[PDB]
Each structure stands twice: as C-alpha cells, then as structure tokens.
C-alpha cells in the first residue's frame with residue numbers, strides 16, 4: 226500500500242510537468258525497494274561518467290593502470306564543458322584526478338580521453354557494465370554526441386533499476402576491494418553538480434555521493450545517489466526524467482521531489 230501511494234504521487238508529478246519519471250530506490254538495510262517505470266529506458270546523459278570512474282578504478286585494481294600515471298593531452302582540442310582538463314592542458318593530469326574530474330564536474334575532455342585510451346570507447350564501457358551483470362546499459366556515442374535524448378531511441382539509455390543495481394554493486398558491493406571502493410565512495414561524495422537534485426531531498430546531515438546528467442534536450446535530466454543516513458544502513462536512489470517536447474527544460478525540482486517520494490516509499 227505504501228508502494229501504491231508512492232506510485233500515485235510519481236504519476237501525478239509526471240503529469241504536472243508533462244513528462245516521464247523513472248525511479249528505483251533500495252534500502253540496503255532491509256532490502257526494501259521501490260520502482261516506478263523502473264524497467265523503462267531513459268537517456269543516461271552524463272550520468273554514465275559515474276560508472277566510467279568505476280571502470281577506471283577496476284583497471285587500477287587489476288594493475289593494468291596506475292592511479293598516478295600522468296595523462297598528457299597538450300594538443301587536444303578540448304570538448305566543450307571541460308572545466309578541469311582545460312586548466313591542466315599544459316601539464317597533464319594524473320589518471321585519478323582526471324577520472325574524478327569526469328565524475329565530479331562532468332568534464333567531457335576527461336571522459337572522452339579516458340574512453341579513448343583506457344576503456345575501448347563506448348563499446349568498452351558497455352562491456353564493463355555487462356561484466357558486473359548489468360544487461361540494460363548501453364553506451365553508443367561519445368561524450369558530446371550522446372545527448373540527443375530522442376524519444377524511442379535506445380542509444381545511450383539504461384533503466385532506473387539497472388542503474389540502481391549497478392551503483393549498489395559498485396559503491397557498496399564487491400566489484401572493488403576495500404581500499405579502491407573507499408576511493409570511489411569519496412569521489413561520489415565530492416560531486417559538485419548535484420546540489421539541487423537528490424542532495425536537496427534529504428536532511429543536510431546525511432552524506433550523499435551522486436552523479437547527475439543533463440542532456441539539454443527533451444528536458445532530460447537524472448541523478449543517482451548512494452546515501453548514508455544518520456545511524457542507518459545505506460540507500461540507493463536512481464531518478465531519470467524526460468519531457469515530451471524537444472525544447473523543454475529539465476526540472477531539478479521534479480528530480481528532488483521524486484527522490485523525496487522514493488525515499489519515503491522504502492522508509
């Protein structure tokens with residue numbers, strides 16, 4: 226019945242903005258879950274950088290890469306929205322600093338470079354996801370081309386459920402060892418682009434790590450988070466939104482509100 230009411234509220238919240246909300250949330254402490262449209266597909270946008278950072282950390286763990294290796298790119302034409310990589314064009318960044326820049330600032334330069342040299346491109350990223358048992362994720366195109374968010378296009382989509390599951394496996398599970406998992410946890414905690422999303426849905430005492438995405442088309446936006454509540458087991462919250470018209474703008478407020486509803490549903 227708690228479930229059924231949470232769902233009516235998402236239903237209404239989506240009609241209010243003329244769009245389409247996908248929700249999955251997990252209380253790791255009880256196993257309780259809430260999903261609404263949790264098996265529908267939605268554009269990832271930048272949200273895949275969260276996973277991309279994880280794949281980097283898996284390669285570091287496997288000893289294929291070193292976390293402090295220098296990454297030089299002094300002749301690159303840096304993609305738009307490369308706020309961190311721009312400031313070190315001349316000197317390069319450590320692999321680790323670069324990966325975290327990709328997560329924490331949605332830096333497209335960091336993203337595309339990492340995917341070029343270390344990850345085998347979009348197919349390699351899809352391969353990583355498969356390898357932790359995520360069958361829904363697909364990345365098709367590179368950082369700046371994956372944002373078209375066209376209704377009915379499976380390219381560069383996942384589902385709220387798959388995203389949530391993957392996040393749990395990565396941020397809380399055993400894909401990454403204790404040391405490496407903690408690093409990844411801190412990277413998520415230091416996300417700078419999520420203040421109006423899932424962060425705005427919880428008491429300010431709770432610690433959140435997250436990755437956002439904003440397609441800038443079809444008013445498509447999303448956020449997924451691990452949440453550490455006061456003296457309580459972790460929650461995972463996954464929220465994805467699209468809108469009916471190409472020109473529509475995304476809605477932080479809707480995302481924050483669907484998060485509130487989702488957290489209550491599993492509470």
Ligand SMILES: *C(=O)[C@@H]([C@@H]1N=C(C(=O)O)[C@@H](S[C@@H]2CN[C@H](C(=O)N(C)C)C2)[C@@H]1C)[C@@H](C)O
Pocket residue numbers: 270271272306330331332333368369372418436437438439440441
């Ligand atoms: C991917 O989705 C795109 C980038 N990732 C974003 C995000 O994480 O939500 C968006 S919004 C971006 C956050 N930094 C900018 C900012 O601080 N404001 C202008 C205030 C906006 C971002 C476009 C993109 C890289 O493809």
